[PDB]
Ligand binder design. Structure first.
Ligand SMILES: *[C@@H](N)c1ccccn1
Lengths: 178, 236
């Protein structure tokens, strides 16, 4: 089959690791959620094409500006994540992550992914965010940011409930295939 | 890897590796600690496996089946012997600490109360310097190693055959040459995550909290130095 590489970037605790784990096991693990993700090689069939998709995390590499880029060589698609419960994680997409990814990897497709969409309808989170005078990211603020950064597309998912996860990685595969 | 250790770390968590008659006698907070400690050791076992795949399958097979100049092979796998020694030793201390802690009559029920000291040891003194220098060296040679792999793959049909041969088993699905190189480079950035989540469930005994806190500082300082010491080498 044909072999493609995917890397997930974005701020620490935007759910990068959780998302990779939920997809790779295909279960929100009931007993223990690993702290770390090593790598994984998914067998995906999308639109009648079979692909081996290698998955890589950048978790832990956020403060280490010469180590982090060693993750990037030969990437075919970037998932650029933010957390819907964290408007600041979205402010940093065009500031920090986009310039980096475009410097190292200028013509790689980027999919912008809003994680933890379940938290949009959560009492605790609405209240906590209201205290710094904010609310959960709205779907149109997401689409607007994706448009602004020249992403290939915008998608939402929730690793906790698995809603949207399969679709993200199927679309990433399609994007890697262009 | 050796069947005994793989068996001891086959389960998805500490909570599933031990007998449940044993699990039930412990507080939730202990279980959450042990789960993360188990994950630290499990991923260290996997990391040593990766390095052994690199030294014994890839490097030695290139030397003994192809007959590439040792200089080319050293470009593909820089510093692997030294990394192998660092991590195999650290692993043997982790596994020794687990074995000391087994219940008599059991090969699986244990609780590790003291990890801090062993982490302080690994990440300070001579052993911490050897890690800083070896990772500065390896991470600086990382990019060159990938380019050299692709050059050899594209040009030499026997090289391709060798690779397709040694990476044919299912158990090497994730462990091609390039994968291996990145798995290693990413290892060091895993240690703070693991150590912080351990520390978060280690408040019960104040000395352990302080030991883990010191270990975390030491790791971040090592990561910091390795990061300052890196400059990609090039070739062609
Ligand atoms: C990103 N695709 C990238 C980085 C470095 C070399 C080649 N590609």
């Amino acid at each position: 089959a044909i072999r493609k590489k995917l890397v997930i970037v974005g701020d620490g605790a935007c759910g990068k690791t959780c998302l990779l784990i939920v997809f790779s096991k295909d279960q929100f693990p009931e007993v223990y959620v690993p702290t770390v993700f090593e790598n994984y090689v998914a067998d995906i069939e999308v639109d009648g094409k079979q692909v081996e998709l290698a998955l890589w995390d950048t978790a832990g590499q956020e403060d280490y500006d010469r180590l982090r880029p060693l993750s990037y060589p030969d990437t075919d698609v970037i998932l650029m994540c933010f957390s819907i419960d964290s408007p600041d994680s979205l402010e940093n997409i065009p500031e920090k992550w986009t310039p980096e990814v475009k410097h190292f990897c200028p013509n790689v497709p980027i999919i912008l992914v809003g994680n933890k969409k379940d938290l949009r309808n959560d009492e605790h989170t609405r209240r906590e965010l209201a205290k710094m005078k904010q609310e959960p990211v709205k779907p149109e603020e997401g689409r607007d940011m994706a448009n602004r950064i020249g992403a290939f597309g915008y998608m939402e998912c929730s690793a906790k409930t698995k809603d949207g996860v399969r679709e993200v990685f199927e679309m990433a595969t399609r994007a890697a295939l262009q | 890897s050796m069947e005994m250790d793989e068996k001891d770390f086959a389960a998805d968590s500490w909570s599933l590796a031990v007998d449940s008659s044993f699990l039930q006698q412990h507080k939730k907070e202990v279980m959450k600690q042990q789960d993360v400690i188990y994950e630290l050791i499990q991923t260290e076992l996997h990391h040593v496996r990766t390095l052994k795949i690199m030294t014994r399958l890839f490097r030695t097979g290139m030397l003994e089946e192809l007959h590439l100049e040792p200089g080319v092979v050293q470009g593909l796998f820089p510093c692997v012997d030294e990394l192998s020694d660092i991590h195999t030793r650290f692993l043997s201390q982790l596994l020794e600490r687990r074995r000391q802690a087994l219940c008599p009559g059991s090969t699986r029920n244990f609780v590790i109360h003291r990890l801090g000291d062993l982490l302080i040891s690994q990440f300070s003194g001579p052993s911490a310097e050897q890690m800083c220098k070896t990772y500065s060296e390896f991470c600086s040679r990382h990019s060159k190693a990938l380019k050299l792999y692709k050059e050899l793959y594209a040009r030499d049909k026997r090289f391709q055959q060798f690779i397709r041969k040694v990476t044919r088993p299912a158990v090497l699905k994730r462990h091609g040459v390039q994968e291996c190189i990145l798995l290693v480079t990413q290892r060091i950035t895993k240690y703070p995550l693991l150590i912080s989540r351990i520390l978060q469930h280690s408040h019960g005994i104040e000395e352990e909290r302080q030991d883990l806190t010191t270990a975390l500082g030491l790791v971040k300082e090592l990561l910091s130095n390795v990061d300052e010491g890196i400059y990609q080498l090039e070739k062609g």
